[PDB]
Amino acid sequence: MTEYKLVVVGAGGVGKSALTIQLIQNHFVDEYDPTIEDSYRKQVVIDGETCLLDILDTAGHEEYSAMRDQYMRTGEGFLCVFAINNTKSFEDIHHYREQIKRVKDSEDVPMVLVGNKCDLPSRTVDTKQAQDLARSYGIPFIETSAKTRQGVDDAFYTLVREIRKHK
Ligand SMILES: COc1cccc(-c2cccc3c2O[C@H](CNC(=O)c2ccc(OCCN(C)C)cc2)CO3)n1
Ligand SMILES: Nc1nc2c(ncn2[C@@H]2O[C@H](COP(=O)(O)OP(=O)(O)NP(=O)(O)O)[C@@H](O)[C@H]2O)c(=O)[nH]1
Ligand SMILES: [Mg+2]
């Protein structure tokens, strides 16, 4: 079956691990254990093609490393995640897109913008703002909650569909 290498990126605390663990294990993690680098694997069927998702879950709180750039170079597509209750994480998205475009050395990298924590009442980033940012990058936007499971499959499966279009 076909293999897709997906990297989940974004600011500390936005829910990159919670999203991934919700996808793999059908489990919400309540505790906040910061990530350095963790990898996961899942077989799924998307649009009738059976495929193997290799998912790399990154750190938020991370300076420069040559190691960070190796795994971003091998990654075929990226979930750029922010939290809808944290405007700074949304502003940081543009930094992640630049970091990616630099290491891949391309304008046209498969990406999906993910607004996580949509279950929380303390919304500070508007759906319309995030849609406009996504439209400006020519990429999809998906609102998710690792807690309710809303959008989780959609986020990963949409990224795979983006990788297919690109090749
Ligand atoms: C066995 O394959 C798996 C399993 C789970 C996740 C991933 C995965 C997902 C997203 C991005 C990834 C991934 O692993 C890739 C392979 N793993 C690596 O650890 C890796 C090995 C060598 C690298 O250098 C690249 C070229 N040259 C120096 C050898 C770089 C990385 C790294 O990027 N791959
Ligand atoms: N209410 C709510 N909480 C969430 C959601 N997603 C993650 N969280 C919470 O946010 C905290 C951070 O989750 P985590 O997955 O650790 O975020 P992260 O981006 O992996 N952090 P890091 O980059 O430091 O590894 C956790 O306590 C978790 O319960 C969500 O959709 N809703
Ligand atoms: Mg994490």
Numbering used by the authors: 1 to 167
Question: What are the paper's exact sentences on this?
Answer:
Here, we employ the intracellular antibody to identify a compound from a chemical fragment library that binds to RAS proteins adjacent to the effector binding region. High-resolution crystal structures show the binding of this compound to mutant RAS, and this structural information facilitates hit to lead development. Our structure-based approach has produced compounds that bind to mutant KRAS with sub-μM affinity that interfere with RAS-effector PPI and endogenous RAS-dependent signalling in human cancer cells, and show a correlation between in vitro binding and potency in the cells. Although, various RAS inhibitors have been described in literature,24–32,47,48, in this paper we describe an approach for the development of RAS-effector inhibitors by combining different elements i.e. (i) the hit identification via a method of intracellular antibody fragment competition; (ii) structure-based design via crystal structures (KRASQ61HGPPNHP) and NMR (waterLOGSY and CPMG); (iii) identification of clear structure-activity relationship (SAR) for the development of potent compounds against KRAS and (iv) the proof of concept in mechanistic and phenotypic cell assays.
This compound forces D54 to rotate to allow the third ring to be accommodated in a pocket formed by S39, Y40, D54, I55 and L56. No H-bond interactions were identified between Abd-5 and the protein, and the only interactions identified were van der Waals contacts to K5, L6, V7, S39, Y40, R41, D54, I55, L56, G70, Y71 and T74. No interactions were observed from the RHS of the molecule. An important feature in Abd-5 and Abd-6 was the lack of interactions between KRASQ61H and the benzamide derivative (Abd-5) or the tetrahydropyran-4-carboxamide (Abd-6), substituted from the original furan group in Abd-2. The values of 220, 38 and 51 nM were found, respectively, for compounds Abd-5, Abd-6 and Abd-7. Compounds Abd-5 and Abd-6 have an effect on the viability (with Abd-5 showing a greater effect on DLD-1 viability); but even at 20 μM and after 72 h, there are surviving cells following incubation with either compound.
